[PDB]
């Protein structure tokens, strides 16, 4: 199997989930995620999705192999993907500003990726409908051509129309608190309905729009990279922190004055605002966001 053939070179990321490494396979960089024991369900889910569904798409992180292996005399669960050397959107936004073309490229490729996940495709070629549930700038990678791809199907949920069956998996993992929709933070989300999970994705994608737009230059100026809600919650905010700010105080990220004098940024501000209605039913769909971005 593929695990045995990889040389781990350096660690590019670490958290409670485990670790991601640059390794070489067949003379190429690959990304290897090594799961912690506390997160083996996310390995199982990603492996399930990539193996049982046809998931090749320019804007979805490309799967190579999933593997079990031994190291230091214990079992490690590995997920091997294409390696993107520009790193995550999160890192990238910190190291560079964007022009209009670069910004729209980033946001259109996210929306294309997400539309693709959300939409059930029929036949011998296709795929069930899929919601992500942990969309954020750290789970989006930047490719050399300026497009992005969506990463981490660990929390993914599926629906298929023949049977109308919802598969929510079996993962105790929760999404990133910073990016939880209101109906998640207030725990009134209807867990038996596929559409609810789509709407949590849209809420999160709104925030990512906001994060990107800040780094687009207009009138020679930019805002510094910041995470959503930077001004009102601490680092590593609690569930209650976010509940107070999003649900109780009803806060939403501020739109800089200067966006309103640029058309690309004005379109983006309206889009992201309609990802952020408290009432989930009111939010734009991925396909609507994609189509609009294709107009600009
Ligand atoms: C975010 O979730 C993941 C990301 C990557 C990944 C990361 C980098 C990278 C490199 C340098 C800096 C930096 O921030 C990221 C490049 N290519 C990649 N594919 C791989 C993953 O599974 C193997 C993964 O879990 C799904």
Residue numbers in the entry: 203 to 498
What did the authors write?
Members of the transforming growth factor-beta (TGF-β) superfamily bind transmembrane receptor serine/threonine kinases to activate Smad and non-Smad pathways for the control of normal development and tissue repair. Ligand binding induces type II receptor phosphorylation of associated type I receptors, leading to Smad recruitment and phosphorylation by the type I receptor. Most importantly, there is an urgent need for selective ALK2 inhibitors to treat the debilitating bone disorder fibrodysplasia ossificans progressiva (FOP). FOP sufferers carry a gain of function mutation in the intracellular domain of ALK2, resulting in episodic bone formation in skeletal muscle and connective tissue that ultimately renders movement impossible.
To define the mode of action of K02288 we determined its structure in complex with the kinase domain of ALK2 refined at 2.15 Å resolution. The entire chain was traced from residues 202–499, including parts of the L45 loop and activation loop (A-loop) that were previously disordered in the structure of the ALK2-FKBP12 complex (data collection and refinement statistics are provided in Table 1). In particular, the ATP pocket remained occluded by the inhibitory conformations of the A-loop and αC helix, which were stabilized by the hydrogen bond interactions of R375 (A-loop) with S244 (αC), D336 (catalytic loop HRD motif) and D354 (A-loop DLG motif). The 2-aminopyridine of K02288 was bound to the kinase hinge region in an ATP-mimetic fashion with two hydrogen bonds to H284 and H286, respectively. The large trimethoxyphenyl substituent occupied the central pocket area sandwiched between the hydrophobic residues V222, L263, L343 and A353. Two of the three methoxy groups additionally formed a water-mediated hydrogen bond to the catalytic lysine (K235). The solvent channel was occupied by the phenol group, which formed an additional hydrogen bond with D293. Notably, the three methoxy substituents were able to extend more deeply towards the recesses of the pocket periphery, potentially contributing to the high selectivity of K02288. In the crystal structure of the ALK2-K02288 complex this group bound to the exposed solvent channel where substitutions are likely to be well tolerated. Here we report a novel 2-aminopyridine inhibitor K02288 with potent and selective activity against type I BMP receptor kinases.
